[PDB]
Paper text:
To define the structural basis for the selective anti-inflammatory property of resveratrol, the ERα LBD was crystallized in complex with resveratrol and the SRC2 nuclear receptor-interacting domain peptide containing an LxxLL motif. Unlike E2, which binds in a single orientation, resveratrol binds to ERα in two different orientations in one subunit of the dimer, shown as conformers #1 and #2. Conformer #1 shows the canonical para phenol of resveratrol mimicking the A-ring of E2, whereas in conformer #2, this is flipped. Also unexpectedly, in the other subunit of the dimer, resveratrol bound predominantly with the resorcinol group mimicking the A-ring of E2, in conformer #2. Compared to the typical phenolic A-ring of the A-CD ring estrogen, the resorcinol group of resveratrol induced a shift in helix 3 via a hydrogen bond with the backbone of Leu387. In turn, the shift in helix 3 disrupts the loop that connects helix 11 to helix 12, which in solution should destabilize helix 12 in the agonist conformation. This impact on helix 12 is visualized by the 2.5 Å shift in the positioning of the γ-carbons of Val534. Notably, the shift in helix 3 also alters binding of the SRC2 peptide at the AF2 surface. Leu693 of the SRC2 peptide binds helix 3 between Val355 and Ile358, and is shifted by 1.6 Å in the resveratrol-bound structure, inducing an overall rotation of the peptide. In summary, resveratrol induced several unique structural perturbations in ERα, including shifts in the helix 11–12 loop, which should modulate helix 12 dynamics, and direct remodeling of the coactivator-binding surface, which could contribute to an altered receptor–coactivator interaction profile and the lack of a proliferative signal.
ER activates transcription in response to estradiol (E2), and a wide cast of other estrogenic compounds, including steroids, phytoestrogens, and environmental estrogens, by either direct binding to DNA, or tethering to DNA-bound transcription factors. Upon agonist binding, the ERα LBD undergoes a conformational change that allows helix 12 to dock across helix 11 and helix 3, thereby forming a coactivator-binding surface called activation function 2 (AF2). Thus the AF2 surface represents a nexus for ligand-mediated control of both recruitment of coregulators to the LBD and allosteric signaling to other domains. We demonstrate that resveratrol is a pathway-selective ERα ligand that modulates the inflammatory response without stimulating proliferation, by binding dynamically to the receptor, inducing an altered AF2 coactivator-binding site, and regulating the recruitment of a cast of coregulators at the IL-6 locus.
Residue numbers in the entry:
A (entry chain B): 305 to 332, 337 to 460, 471 to 548
B (entry chain D), D (entry chain C): 688 to 696
C (entry chain A): 305 to 461, 472 to 548
């Protein structure tokens, strides 16, 4: 009811202030080993993501049941764009934590994992080719939270999304981009979210085939987050 | 759901 | 090459002119549906549409400019997304229903006939309600469908593809401007249109999983072409 | 692949 009040600059500051902390891995090396690290890291990040979601303007306005639906839909998407963002400075590597930088080949420690790594690495390359900005990152991530499950006067969430588009554009204008360049970059940015959705769907399947085979125990939170998609 | 609880907490 | 030189209007009409026809299903109204026969209907339809899609793609500016291997990869990636956005678009004027074909217009209760099918119906219906809520225009529709073809598999590979995509962005903005939207409405709407593609991707991935489990359960025989479009995804 | 042949014709 008040996120529609924010200035572009205030939306950016809000989103930046809301950023979750960067966590370390328990890492001190098998298929079990590595899966435990990744999923254990994921469980801990998920808890911090909830605090973050709650600081996204417009989100706390929603019913509890709608917040649950949005996070259940978007969680792995949000986890992954975070990962990709972190790994942007490390070509060919994935920065899960500051003490867990994994090259492409280490993805083969776990079965089926390297195919997912490749997509994450290519998205990261794409962020780098675009010179993706932190201010742009946090808008993109907020957009995912509000958008991914939204299709399920019910027009408020769409107003918040518009405000975030306004913010992305503000950032670009500020950077000295022409009108035609703002528009093309805005499009470029958003088409990435289609690749991020794809990676999440693939990640979800793999995670779920890992639950069954049983290489490693998953947290209760993780299981419920997973089962919302099954 | 745990998530319900996280959100409230 | 010649693609990057197209005006916005030249882009629009090239894409409108490329539109595939609306094909009929084999629907036989003398017999009841079974899971098997409704799936046969949808897969038979998809197979025939694919042949049109393949020829459509060749008419999308800058597409034939790519290697054969690049065309194969893009189409293999986007085919179901492309089938699905067409369906949602045809279903726009039929709230609560999906127009697979002029002779195959199904509601969700009919969707329940196929195990696991109603969930995907529900997503497609909701997206259809989104097109209706935004008053999506056919010019915008053809732009989006072309963006899916060029974008969906573009990061499973460069510059030439991006050039055409930027050109399609110019086209959308031009259409919106020409339609009297304000500078702000233009960027807002451009974002709403593109966000649709995240949902189309989602529904494609789910449909792909569902199609796959029909194949693996011998519910229905798939054409060799369909089996290969499907295999591309696993 | 059928598509590869189909894309030429
Ligand atoms: O089987 C699996 C498939 C994918 C994953 C991904 C884990 C993961 C953990 C993070 O902290 C961030 C992230 O972006 C991803 C884990 C297990
Ligand atoms: O225009 C269209 C033509 C055909 C289809 C088919 C969708 C579909 C979805 C499934 O989960 C399984 C399946 O066998 C088919 C969708 C759109």
């Amino acid at each position: 009811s008040l996120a529609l009040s924010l200035t572009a600059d205030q939306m950016v500051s809000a989103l930046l202030d809301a950023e979750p902390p960067i966590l370390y891995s328990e890492y001190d090396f098998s298929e079990a080993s590595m899966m435990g690290l990744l999923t254990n890291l994921a469980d801990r990040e998920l808890v911090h993501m909830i605090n973050w979601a709650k600081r996204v303007p417009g989100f706390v306005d929603l019913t509890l049941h709608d917040q649950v639906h949005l996070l259940e839909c978007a969680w792995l998407e949000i986890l992954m764009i975070g990962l990709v963002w972190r790994s942007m400075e490390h070509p060919g590597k994935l920065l899960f934590a500051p003490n867990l930088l994994l090259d492409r080949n280490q993805g083969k420690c776990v079965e089926g994992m390297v195919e997912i790594f490749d997509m994450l690495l290519a998205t990261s390359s794409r962020f780098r080719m675009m010179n993706l900005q932190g201010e742009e990152f946090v808008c993109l991530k907020s957009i995912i939270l509000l958008n991914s499950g939204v299709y399920t006067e019910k027009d408020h969430i769409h107003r918040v999304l518009d405000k975030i588009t306004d913010t992305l554009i503000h950032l670009m204008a500020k950077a000295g981009l022409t009108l035609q360049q703002q528009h093309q970059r805005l499009a470029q940015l958003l088409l990435i979210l289609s690749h991020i959705r794809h990676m999440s769907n693939k990640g979800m399947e793999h995670l779920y085939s890992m639950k069954c085979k049983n290489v490693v125990p998953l947290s209760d939170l993780l299981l419920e987050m997973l089962d919302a998609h099954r | 759901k745990i998530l319900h609880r996280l959100l409230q907490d």
